[PDB]
Amino acid sequence: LCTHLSYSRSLSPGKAVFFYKTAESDFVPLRIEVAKISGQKCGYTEGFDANLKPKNIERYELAYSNPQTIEACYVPPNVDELYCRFSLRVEANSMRPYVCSNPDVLRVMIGLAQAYQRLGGYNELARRYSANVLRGIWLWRNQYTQGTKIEIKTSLGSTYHIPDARRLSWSGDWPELEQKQLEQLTSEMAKALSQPDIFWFADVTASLKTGFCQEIFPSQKFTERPDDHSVASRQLATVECSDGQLAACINPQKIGAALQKIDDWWANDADLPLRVHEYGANHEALTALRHPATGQDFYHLLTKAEQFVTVLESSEGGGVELPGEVHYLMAVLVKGGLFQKG
Amino acid sequence: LCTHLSYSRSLSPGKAVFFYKTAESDFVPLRIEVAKISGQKCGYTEGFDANLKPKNIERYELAYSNPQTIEACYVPPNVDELYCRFSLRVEANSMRPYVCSNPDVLRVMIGLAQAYQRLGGYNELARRYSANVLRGIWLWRNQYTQGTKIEIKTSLGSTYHIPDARRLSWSGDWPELEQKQLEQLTSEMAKALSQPDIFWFADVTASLKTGFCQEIFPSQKFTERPDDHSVASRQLATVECSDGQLAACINPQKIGAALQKIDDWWANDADLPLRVHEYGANHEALTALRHPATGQDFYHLLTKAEQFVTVLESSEGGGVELPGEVHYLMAVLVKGGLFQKG
Amino acid sequence: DRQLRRYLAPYSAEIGVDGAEKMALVVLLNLTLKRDRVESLCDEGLARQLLSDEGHITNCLHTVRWLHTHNLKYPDARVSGERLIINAPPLIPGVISSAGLPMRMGWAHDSSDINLAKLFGTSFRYRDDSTNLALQLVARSKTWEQALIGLGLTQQQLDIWCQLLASNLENNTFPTVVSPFSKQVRFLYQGNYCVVTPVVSHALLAQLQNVVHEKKLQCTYIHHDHPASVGSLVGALGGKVAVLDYPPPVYLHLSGLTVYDASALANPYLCGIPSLSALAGFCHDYERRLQSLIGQSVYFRGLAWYLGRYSLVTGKHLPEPSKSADPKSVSAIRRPGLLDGRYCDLGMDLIIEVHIPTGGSLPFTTCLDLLRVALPARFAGGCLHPPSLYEEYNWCTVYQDKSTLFTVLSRLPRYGCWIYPSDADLRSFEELSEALALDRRLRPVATGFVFLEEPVERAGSIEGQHVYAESAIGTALCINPVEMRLAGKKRFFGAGFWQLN
DNA sequence: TTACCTC
DNA sequence: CCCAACTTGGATGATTTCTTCCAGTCCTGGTAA
């Protein structure tokens, strides 16, 4: 192909904030607190050296405590509902390369995006993204509630409401008056993703029914180990409110990673879906599912466009003929990045 | 062993708050006071040096007081009953490693948890945890009442009632109508520990019948060394209420340290139970029961998993055949943490 | 004494060696060993012994090939290719740059030449000017040669070195191609586009490290992992480099805009208000998008900036694992590397002076929709959003009257800031220190770039011609809403709007 | 296929 | 509506400011032969 090729990102979210209501004011932030604790002396190198060779210490030396400083966050007594919200904008921005160093490569990438659009296929991507919003998986470790409600508004005037999100699976069929809203939402998004000159903007709120003083899990900061012992080892992310107070939040890219978890196209065995990645990275197992050695990765597939366009053009469309390799590639172009040295 | 291996925490409380009721309102917080006192000049090194000549002090030099600043907490006049409340969530979360870098380790840890589940054994752990909730040992030093009444509600609609918890032992036979509730509670929890996608909650409230102005013992802060003569030498923990008042509390991990105190599998002589610890730490005597030098610790045992699965598979089960070494291991996996750098 | 090593460090004031050339050769040669092996830099014997080792000196002579005036690797050790040696650009009265500083060189090649590079690349004051050992020997400076032969060097060994030492400084002064890990940005110049690549000035950064500590200026520190892999100065400073820190004291009308994670580090020398080159950039990408929607020609003469909220965010971003541990037969993924930056969240309004060339204009609802569509999603490296939907009002209004527009603007909250252009001309950091001591409204800002060469065709350019440049440091004023309520619409519309050139 | 270094 | 508003003498004495033992990791570099 060519020395330089790249796309920017087409689907971008905001920062999510936690808050609650009172009888006296409509918006009170949830906030974090800091505290000293007494820890344990446990684990390897604490008692063993090399490969299971005990080291020489006295019996009493492990009964001592290990103090630490952490930040933490809890819902205060007597709050019945906790609320969380974020904004979302979607642009039809995978139709054109941000940069390209070769006119012959450029005309081909354009041909492909269009050949795909008219046969169907944006619906498929929209259905998958839509499902992840309405399921609620973007709450990560805070999904364990006594009841979760999700509400969405858009710039076109529509409103959607899931009376209880706790049971919607990735694989399966949704209850009536829920399955239907998934279809309607899919239509708005499928268009926003591919047709330009449409402004679309969404506002997603949810509510969590909680326990008496339940623990809450906001995003964590990346830090250096302090050398002071007066500074926290585990620091949490907050956002500044319009009134000057700070509140617990979830970072944009953490919301984003959840929304794009849609890849169950690998190895012809769906399992659970992966975060889209050029090499099929699997963070839980610390490995990769589309190792270059298999021929299944993005970079091998990027060179078969001429063959794919030929098929797309020869196909009738409107059926189930689109192959995994074409869908995969379109999903990667949506999460744009650097595809150079080709 | 391997480089990465982690489990999450499968059983946990939120924090406990002290409060009382009045005729006009259902929730009045218990609060703390701050004061200067006149102490004693006493103890070794006050008058000695390496137990030799007791310095060079005139007789009158020890008659003087030693002032100090402390915080304290008392029940106000004419309040007949004090209430303490917290919530508990349990997850079936020891069936699978949060992170594992080795596929050969992973298949074994899964095989073991399953081999164990179907022969019984979660019932055993559930009974041990359940006994500690109903006994009331999580009040620590506040158990000295004129009568303690414990009531529990759950998300499945059950209710339990212990009319007087002051006399139930770890070892012994509970009186009728109480033995019955221990069995019923055991069954709900035994399921919560092993079956996924059950959202189970318990809500525990206890009533304390007290003295005229009895002293109360909430959690203390772990503080930095003072040098300003202005900061209290002993400070108590509180929570902030939605209305801005502060209230006395017991920390989450302080409640948890009591609930998980179920380990009497060492030395073939049960005595009193220890808090589960990889090295068998004993805080009262400042020692360690499962010192690496004995071969009885978690890390020695973690390497024999292949042999335990083999035994379990050859056994019948459903009886009392499971050995202490298997129970210990499962108890540690329930209090998940880091098991790394093999 | 460690103070001798401090005074010979790249971040310290230069010291004189006139009449001491003999001990200067001894100390400078002794610096080529690890500190653990040397009890003193003053031992003549060790120096006479080191000098006789042609291999040790040969390894030292080889480092000369990568001495530079500007450092192409500074922000990112991954950049690979040739060195850059250029005389400082002509002085611009309104810009702080290397133009007012004397000639100095530094070193940065494989990270294992930290000690061996010190023999020739260490500067000092001599004959009341700034020089170093390589220059005095290449120029055939007899006093230094007489001392060097006296310390045990054979005349024949010197006659050969003068040639090889000179040869290493006679070529490879400009890169052949643009390196794949360098920065590229493009703007209009003389009616067409040109790609600009910035580079950090050695002389300018080294001076700043001394001035902020001596003049007591507001500053912070940026960390670098593996200092030996970035350069002479960064290594000498232990991986911690000081920068200035001057935060703010906090017609088409765009209201209520929110930016998440904006880059708060304008240039490698200054933290504070985001680089103005980025706003000019934004105005234009917005103009091009609108022009592709409306058939009529549309053009933006000026752009104004207002600050309502400013919050600094701590910490740093973790890179995606985009790099395989090994190219083949490995199923492990590694992290590319880590950088130390600064970020903030903004709330701001813009007032753009929009002009339509055609006699007949399109003041219609359709155009208001197209103005909402054309709005970019990216700003200053962060993410840009409109005001939230549940509380939406008309955030995109248009005015054709100065009286109505000024009247509405006078109503803004008193705790915000307008940013105006400054009048003062500054040529050094010391002049900036005095100007900042006297005012309370004055702040340094990044303003643009100064060229090092004329635009040329060069392999690796994204589009058309390519040029190298250094960052331009200038200033701006922070004005309270109360001051323009009194100044009047006359002063606001004359002074309150910014432009390019 | 192996190691070598910044106050 | 309209007119007023206060001088003075004075503001403490004794002696003491505590202790024990602990301070966890792990994945995140170019360059050369």
PDB file of all heavy atoms in Angstrom, chain A residues 230-242:
ATOM      1  N   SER A 230       2.815  10.088  53.664  1.00  0.00           N
ATOM      2  CA  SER A 230       1.707  10.948  54.047  1.00  0.00           C
ATOM      3  C   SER A 230       0.776  11.175  52.851  1.00  0.00           C
ATOM      4  O   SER A 230      -0.173  11.938  52.945  1.00  0.00           O
ATOM      5  CB  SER A 230       2.228  12.276  54.565  1.00  0.00           C
ATOM      6  OG  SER A 230       2.933  12.961  53.567  1.00  0.00           O
ATOM      7  N   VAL A 231       1.064  10.500  51.738  1.00  0.00           N
ATOM      8  CA  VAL A 231       0.345  10.643  50.474  1.00  0.00           C
ATOM      9  C   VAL A 231      -0.238   9.304  50.051  1.00  0.00           C
ATOM     10  O   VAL A 231       0.451   8.307  50.085  1.00  0.00           O
ATOM     11  CB  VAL A 231       1.282  11.169  49.371  1.00  0.00           C
ATOM     12  CG1 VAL A 231       0.542  11.266  48.046  1.00  0.00           C
ATOM     13  CG2 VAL A 231       1.848  12.522  49.774  1.00  0.00           C
ATOM     14  N   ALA A 232      -1.504   9.289  49.654  1.00  0.00           N
ATOM     15  CA  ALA A 232      -2.207   8.066  49.257  1.00  0.00           C
ATOM     16  C   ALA A 232      -1.629   7.169  48.160  1.00  0.00           C
ATOM     17  O   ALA A 232      -1.185   7.648  47.144  1.00  0.00           O
ATOM     18  CB  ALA A 232      -3.639   8.412  48.915  1.00  0.00           C
ATOM     19  N   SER A 233      -1.634   5.851  48.368  1.00  0.00           N
ATOM     20  CA  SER A 233      -1.106   4.979  47.340  1.00  0.00           C
ATOM     21  C   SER A 233      -2.142   4.681  46.275  1.00  0.00           C
ATOM     22  O   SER A 233      -1.791   4.363  45.152  1.00  0.00           O
ATOM     23  CB  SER A 233      -0.620   3.683  47.961  1.00  0.00           C
ATOM     24  OG  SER A 233       0.470   3.912  48.811  1.00  0.00           O
ATOM     25  N   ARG A 234      -3.420   4.759  46.638  1.00  0.00           N
ATOM     26  CA  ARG A 234      -4.508   4.523  45.698  1.00  0.00           C
ATOM     27  C   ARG A 234      -5.405   5.743  45.604  1.00  0.00           C
ATOM     28  O   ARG A 234      -6.214   5.978  46.482  1.00  0.00           O
ATOM     29  CB  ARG A 234      -5.334   3.316  46.117  1.00  0.00           C
ATOM     30  CG  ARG A 234      -6.459   2.947  45.163  1.00  0.00           C
ATOM     31  CD  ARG A 234      -7.006   1.598  45.454  1.00  0.00           C
ATOM     32  NE  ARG A 234      -7.840   1.595  46.644  1.00  0.00           N
ATOM     33  CZ  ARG A 234      -9.172   1.794  46.645  1.00  0.00           C
ATOM     34  NH1 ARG A 234      -9.806   2.009  45.514  1.00  0.00           N
ATOM     35  NH2 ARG A 234      -9.842   1.773  47.785  1.00  0.00           N
ATOM     36  N   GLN A 235      -5.268   6.506  44.526  1.00  0.00           N
ATOM     37  CA  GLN A 235      -5.974   7.771  44.374  1.00  0.00           C
ATOM     38  C   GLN A 235      -7.061   7.667  43.324  1.00  0.00           C
ATOM     39  O   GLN A 235      -6.851   7.085  42.282  1.00  0.00           O
ATOM     40  CB  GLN A 235      -4.998   8.889  44.000  1.00  0.00           C
ATOM     41  CG  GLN A 235      -3.941   9.171  45.056  1.00  0.00           C
ATOM     42  CD  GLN A 235      -2.887  10.149  44.574  1.00  0.00           C
ATOM     43  OE1 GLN A 235      -3.167  11.035  43.762  1.00  0.00           O
ATOM     44  NE2 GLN A 235      -1.666   9.991  45.070  1.00  0.00           N
ATOM     45  N   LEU A 236      -8.229   8.233  43.609  1.00  0.00           N
ATOM     46  CA  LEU A 236      -9.371   8.106  42.720  1.00  0.00           C
ATOM     47  C   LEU A 236      -9.620   9.377  41.949  1.00  0.00           C
ATOM     48  O   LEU A 236      -9.306  10.452  42.418  1.00  0.00           O
ATOM     49  CB  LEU A 236     -10.628   7.741  43.522  1.00  0.00           C
ATOM     50  CG  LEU A 236     -10.535   6.461  44.360  1.00  0.00           C
ATOM     51  CD1 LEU A 236     -11.782   6.324  45.222  1.00  0.00           C
ATOM     52  CD2 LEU A 236     -10.371   5.261  43.438  1.00  0.00           C
ATOM     53  N   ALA A 237     -10.197   9.217  40.762  1.00  0.00           N
ATOM     54  CA  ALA A 237     -10.594  10.297  39.850  1.00  0.00           C
ATOM     55  C   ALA A 237     -11.861  11.042  40.243  1.00  0.00           C
ATOM     56  O   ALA A 237     -12.856  10.430  40.574  1.00  0.00           O
ATOM     57  CB  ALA A 237     -10.740   9.752  38.448  1.00  0.00           C
ATOM     58  N   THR A 238     -11.813  12.370  40.165  1.00  0.00           N
ATOM     59  CA  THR A 238     -12.949  13.241  40.478  1.00  0.00           C
ATOM     60  C   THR A 238     -13.131  14.301  39.408  1.00  0.00           C
ATOM     61  O   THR A 238     -12.179  14.651  38.735  1.00  0.00           O
ATOM     62  CB  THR A 238     -12.771  13.920  41.849  1.00  0.00           C
ATOM     63  OG1 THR A 238     -11.609  14.758  41.824  1.00  0.00           O
ATOM     64  CG2 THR A 238     -12.618  12.876  42.945  1.00  0.00           C
ATOM     65  N   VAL A 239     -14.301  14.926  39.334  1.00  0.00           N
ATOM     66  CA  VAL A 239     -14.524  16.040  38.408  1.00  0.00           C
ATOM     67  C   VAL A 239     -14.996  17.274  39.175  1.00  0.00           C
ATOM     68  O   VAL A 239     -15.675  17.136  40.171  1.00  0.00           O
ATOM     69  CB  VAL A 239     -15.570  15.661  37.344  1.00  0.00           C
ATOM     70  CG1 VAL A 239     -16.920  15.396  37.995  1.00  0.00           C
ATOM     71  CG2 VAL A 239     -15.682  16.769  36.309  1.00  0.00           C
ATOM     72  N   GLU A 240     -14.588  18.451  38.713  1.00  0.00           N
ATOM     73  CA  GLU A 240     -14.954  19.716  39.333  1.00  0.00           C
ATOM     74  C   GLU A 240     -16.337  20.097  38.871  1.00  0.00           C
ATOM     75  O   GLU A 240     -16.580  20.216  37.682  1.00  0.00           O
ATOM     76  CB  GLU A 240     -13.953  20.817  38.982  1.00  0.00           C
ATOM     77  CG  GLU A 240     -14.187  22.134  39.710  1.00  0.00           C
ATOM     78  CD  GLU A 240     -13.152  23.174  39.385  1.00  0.00           C
ATOM     79  OE1 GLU A 240     -12.294  22.900  38.580  1.00  0.00           O
ATOM     80  OE2 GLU A 240     -13.217  24.244  39.943  1.00  0.00           O
ATOM     81  N   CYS A 241     -17.207  20.440  39.807  1.00  0.00           N
ATOM     82  CA  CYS A 241     -18.565  20.810  39.456  1.00  0.00           C
ATOM     83  C   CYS A 241     -18.633  22.319  39.268  1.00  0.00           C
ATOM     84  O   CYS A 241     -17.711  23.042  39.622  1.00  0.00           O
ATOM     85  CB  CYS A 241     -19.551  20.376  40.539  1.00  0.00           C
ATOM     86  SG  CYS A 241     -19.631  18.585  40.791  1.00  0.00           S
ATOM     87  N   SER A 242     -19.732  22.797  38.706  1.00  0.00           N
ATOM     88  CA  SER A 242     -19.887  24.214  38.408  1.00  0.00           C
ATOM     89  C   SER A 242     -19.861  25.093  39.652  1.00  0.00           C
ATOM     90  O   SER A 242     -19.615  26.289  39.566  1.00  0.00           O
ATOM     91  CB  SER A 242     -21.190  24.436  37.663  1.00  0.00           C
ATOM     92  OG  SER A 242     -22.291  24.160  38.483  1.00  0.00           O
TER      93      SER A 242
END
